[PDB]
């Protein structure tokens, strides 16, 4: 969490994703880590 | 593991750090070694 709100939920689950759930599931005995929130990425907006 | 042309750099980054997010907690793993070399490969050895 970010009680300082200085990252929006974005931003933690980015970094929760790249740099937490890795070495999470890096430990003995931890059979699966469902990440509840997504990596970041560069998202398009077209208009039609 | 093979993906050819890519340099090791790749190959560690996409493909050896997946692998290894499920090598572990593999039964009675002694040790686990990964190597990927400039020939586009990788080896992942799991010790039992």
Known sequence: NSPNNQYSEVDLSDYLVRNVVEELKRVEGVGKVQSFGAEKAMRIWVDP | ????????????????????????????????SATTDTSGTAEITATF
Do not use: F, M
């Open chain 2, 1 to 32: 593991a093979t993906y050819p042309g890519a340099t090791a750099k790749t190959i560690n980054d996409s493909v050896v750090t997946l692998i290894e997010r499920e090598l572990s907690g593999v039964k009675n793993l002694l040790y686990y």
